[PDB]
Amino acid sequence: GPHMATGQDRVVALVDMDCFFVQVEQRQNPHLRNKPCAVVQYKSWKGGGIIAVSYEARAFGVTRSMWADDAKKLCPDLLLAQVRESRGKANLTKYREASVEVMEIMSRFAVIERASIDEAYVDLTSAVQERLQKLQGQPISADLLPSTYIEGLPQGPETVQKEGMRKQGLFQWLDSLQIDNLTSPDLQLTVGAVIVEEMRAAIERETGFQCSAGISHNKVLAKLACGLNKPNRQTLVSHGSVPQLFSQMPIRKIRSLGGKLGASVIEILGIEYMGELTQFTESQLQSHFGEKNGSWLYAMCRGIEHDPVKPRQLPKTIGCSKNFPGKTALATREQVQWWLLQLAQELEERLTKDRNDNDRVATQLVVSIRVQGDKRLSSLRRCCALTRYDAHKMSHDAFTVIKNCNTSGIQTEWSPPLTMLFLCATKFSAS
DNA sequence: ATTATGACGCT
DNA sequence: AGCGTCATA
Ligand SMILES: [Mn+2]
Ligand SMILES: [Mn+2]
Ligand SMILES: [Mn+2]
């Protein structure tokens, strides 16, 4: 037992913005605040597609992926903000810029890994050691954790309100703590949670945006923790909380297991919950899911994961894409060339801003298309050199690499019609 | 006809 | 390199 690594060496947090694109629009338009509200892209087809939903609107059953016309059936007073359109397409610049606001604040506390437009991991291990340094063995007051939930508590041997339950759990947690031990993982997580309160307070003070967070010993548990008490709260998932938590946790809830692999774990092993994985040897799991996945599952079901928080605050690709669904599919050369130019002009604008802001240049242009009839997201993916930030050159180059995908006899018709265009700049070098 | 992204793994 | 998988607003 004394040699079995417990995966408690790190303190890792995940901070995720609440209903992020909705909050961006609510900051801008005070009339949308504290309302059932959603963000929609486009409009003509079924009212547009919903991509973010306020918690008030969720109460009516409104979700992402829903057509606005259908959401209005559940929630007639639903308010809608539209994604900007530029050069004929949805343009997400407002939300990318709001993201940078939050990421730059988080970066003041620790090096971050940008994991999406609205969330980042933080390795707080070093910051926790120094805060423990300056605490002088002083206990942690509940006042320092005003929005923190301790997963699994309260428990054991009155009160039916939810804030009261949070405090009860927190009280039990702090009561059990050993603040005398600067190496105690539970104490380290608790100090991590104090820092994340500070981080989240700073984000809200300086941007107007609320967020949730999870604190644990690794990225997967931090991510899971974060969702447990959204919105506007943070959750601490201790190592000790994992057996109960995982005993009823569907496998698909764990990050990376929400797709085909997770379904195969369930199918092959005849299990449902994360905790049930503990009954298989590492070699058994490797036999079914491969060396890497098998080792990962073996540790993960015990609450252990080693994936580091990467020091990367900026995306490593900048891309532009557009679907051409139904009968809007591009069937002529002039059409294909027009849209490549629109994408290329947005790409140039974003690339040029990126070079000025971030002292780097992209060196490879990736061009991707989908053809009508193909089930795959992408039908074809080709790269070429990106030597100049020039939209006409990039669009001309993109057309050159896709030129013979056209099985048309004639020059000017495009067959089979294109249902997606994608331009992506990659392979950055310092500049 | 959810769309527009973005990262990582396989071979 | 090109494809697949998984993820997130
Ligand atoms: Mn979010
Ligand atoms: Mn998110
Ligand atoms: Mn989401």
Side-chain angles (χ1 to χ4, degrees), chain A residues 1-157 159-431:
Chain A
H3 305 297
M4 41 148 289
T6 61
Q8 292 176 103
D9 41 319
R10 298 180 290 157
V11 180
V12 174
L14 182 275
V15 177
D16 182 278
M17 309 304 295
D18 296 337
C19 53
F20 185 42
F21 289 11
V22 160
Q23 288 198 88
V24 176
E25 297 293 335
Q26 286 172 321
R27 179 172 75 172
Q28 186 179 334
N29 182 358
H31 283 145
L32 305 178
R33 299 180 184 178
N34 306 296
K35 295 274 193 174
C37 179
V39 172
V40 71
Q41 98 206 315
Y42 306 118
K43 158 95 172 146
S44 108
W45 188 263
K46 312 183 70 154
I50 293 173
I51 56 172
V53 189
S54 81
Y55 281 80
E56 296 79 356
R58 298 186 191 188
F60 289 83
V62 180
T63 66
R64 156 177 307 135
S65 86
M66 202 171 274
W67 298 117
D69 286 348
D70 298 331
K72 277 290 197 174
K73 304 172 183 169
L74 300 173
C75 183
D77 302 318
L78 178 71
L79 302 182
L80 302 173
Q82 297 185 243
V83 175
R84 173 170 152 191
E85 285 172 51
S86 300
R87 310 188 215 265
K89 63 180 298 296
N91 188 296
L92 306 176
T93 297
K94 188 195 300 182
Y95 314 107
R96 288 192 187 95
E97 294 183 342
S99 177
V100 167
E101 291 183 69
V102 175
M103 300 303 171
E104 293 189 329
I105 293 162
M106 295 181 61
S107 293
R108 306 207 299 260
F109 295 81
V111 128
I112 73 177
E113 178 177 353
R114 180 201 198 267
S116 81
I117 198 166
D118 93 319
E119 75 206 80
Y121 297 91
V122 210
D123 189 314
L124 292 175
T125 307
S126 67
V128 159
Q129 286 309 121
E130 333 203 331
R131 181 69 56 88
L132 277 166
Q133 261 183 351
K134 285 144 220 69
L135 272 192
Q136 295 128 290
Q138 178 170 111
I140 297 185
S141 161
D143 289 343
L144 293 190
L145 297 162
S147 64
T148 296
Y149 278 85
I150 312 298
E151 173 63 27
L153 298 180
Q155 134 207 299
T159 183
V160 308
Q161 69 179 296
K162 146 206 91 73
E163 166 65 16
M165 285 282 299
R166 183 196 74 81
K167 280 192 181 76
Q168 272 170 336
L170 180 59
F171 276 159
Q172 288 183 357
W173 176 253
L174 295 176
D175 272 332
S176 303
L177 276 190
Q178 192 45 253
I179 39 81
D180 197 31
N181 188 2
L182 266 58
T183 66
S184 161
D186 287 343
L187 174 59
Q188 291 168 352
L189 294 184
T190 306
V191 175
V194 172
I195 292 168
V196 172
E197 292 276 8
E198 298 169 353
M199 297 182 60
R200 289 180 48 247
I203 293 168
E204 182 174 12
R205 188 185 82 76
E206 303 181 22
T207 70
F209 304 143
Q210 286 177 354
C211 60
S212 299
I215 306 92
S216 200
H217 291 300
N218 55 63
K219 288 161 96 185
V220 162
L221 290 179
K223 176 61 180 181
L224 184 68
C226 183
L228 289 175
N229 293 285
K230 274 190 162 271
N232 199 35
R233 297 286 183 270
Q234 51 182 69
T235 307
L236 188 163
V237 162
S238 66
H239 184 75
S241 79
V242 174
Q244 291 205 244
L245 184 60
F246 276 7
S247 72
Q248 296 185 273
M249 181 67 57
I251 287 151
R252 69 186 176 267
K253 301 303 184 182
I254 273 60
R255 192 188 179 281
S256 87
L257 301 182
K260 293 180 183 177
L261 179 59
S264 69
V265 173
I266 292 164
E267 247 276 316
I268 291 182
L269 298 180
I271 64 174
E272 292 181 49
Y273 305 118
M274 207 63 193
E276 298 180 81
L277 283 163
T278 63
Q279 294 312 289
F280 298 94
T281 65
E282 184 172 16
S283 299
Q284 276 178 312
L285 297 179
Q286 286 174 321
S287 76
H288 298 295
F289 310 113
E291 185 171 346
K292 192 173 167 290
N293 283 334
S295 287
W296 183 86
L297 289 164
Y298 182 85
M300 193 65 252
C301 71
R302 294 164 168 79
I304 300 172
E305 203 220 5
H306 295 329
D307 183 40
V309 174
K310 312 189 159 171
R312 187 188 52 242
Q313 172 181 1
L314 309 172
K316 48 167 60 165
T317 62
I318 296 181
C320 293
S321 70
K322 179 151 178 36
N323 287 351
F324 304 94
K327 316 176 183 38
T328 74
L330 314 182
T332 76
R333 160 197 306 194
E334 295 263 305
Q335 232 185 339
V336 168
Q337 287 170 347
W338 188 83
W339 279 108
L340 286 170
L341 182 58
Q342 299 325 285
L343 287 184
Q345 282 171 5
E346 176 181 333
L347 194 53
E348 181 193 308
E349 177 172 358
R350 284 163 60 193
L351 280 176
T352 299
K353 175 63 144 60
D354 184 77
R355 192 180 57 205
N356 287 321
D357 286 354
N358 297 318
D359 299 318
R360 58 178 191 177
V361 284
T363 67
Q364 185 169 68
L365 178 74
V366 191
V367 187
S368 180
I369 64 180
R370 187 182 180 190
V371 211
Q372 173 181 318
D374 197 318
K375 186 187 175 181
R376 296 171 300 172
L377 162 93
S378 171
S379 298
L380 181 131
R381 164 107 70 135
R382 301 274 196 267
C383 66
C384 64
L386 211 174
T387 66
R388 273 202 202 71
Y389 283 7
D390 184 280
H392 288 101
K393 168 165 182 57
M394 285 194 288
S395 57
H396 181 263
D397 287 341
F399 178 71
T400 300
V401 341
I402 70 154
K403 252 161 121 41
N404 314 126
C405 294
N406 189 10
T407 60
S408 148
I410 174 73
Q411 49 187 329
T412 59
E413 309 312 301
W414 196 290
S415 63
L418 299 183
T419 55
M420 184 271 295
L421 299 177
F422 182 32
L423 288 181
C424 189
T426 73
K427 303 192 166 166
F428 287 92
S429 304
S431 83

